[PDB]
DNA sequence: TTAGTATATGTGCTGCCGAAGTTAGCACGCTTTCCACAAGATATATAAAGCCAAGAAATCGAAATACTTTCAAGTTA
């Protein structure tokens, strides 16, 4: 179980399933998707995960203990939104 | 035969609670059977329309996609 035995490099020369869809996928970006943008929610979720990796209280009595219980809850306040977009209407919470 | 005693003799006492009767003057005001006589419940046109419930077709309601708009960030300049 080491990295000098694992396989930067084109996936490709290989049967595979999932690398039709990963092809197909590339195509359609070279199509019309210019560079690396347009990706708003996503580098937005990106930075509000990243805004919890590794920071360290203030004060050394604010450490969380181990084992604290973390509750993702979802909120839906307003009626100012897509109806028809499968619901995606506020933001979600950890407490 | 006569004095002592038990009984009933009607009598006379006590309470016994109740009995009739009282309280003053106007103006307002259901069961068994048994029973018998006649009335369900019966075919049958019959024209007529209104009603009350299975089916078949129709359209309304709206949900999951297809167009256009719209930004917003990024391109040739």
Same mark, same amino acid.
């Given at each position: 179980c080491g990295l000098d035995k694992l396989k930067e490099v084109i996936p490709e020369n290989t049967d595979l399933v999932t690398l039709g869809v990963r092809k197909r996928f590339l195509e359609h970006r070279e199509e019309? #998707?210019? #560079?690396?943008?347009?990706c708003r929610q996503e580098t937005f979720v990106y930075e509000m995960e990243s805004h919890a990796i590794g920071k360290k209280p203030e004060?050394?009595?604010?450490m969380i203990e181990e084992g604290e219980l973390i509750l993702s809850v979802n909120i839906l306040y307003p009626? #100012?939104? %897509? /109806? %028809? /977009?499968?619901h995606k209407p506020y933001q979600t919470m950890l407490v």
């Open positions: 019309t #998707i210019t #560079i690396d943008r347009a004060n050394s009595a604010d009626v #100012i939104f %897509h /109806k %028809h /977009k499968e």
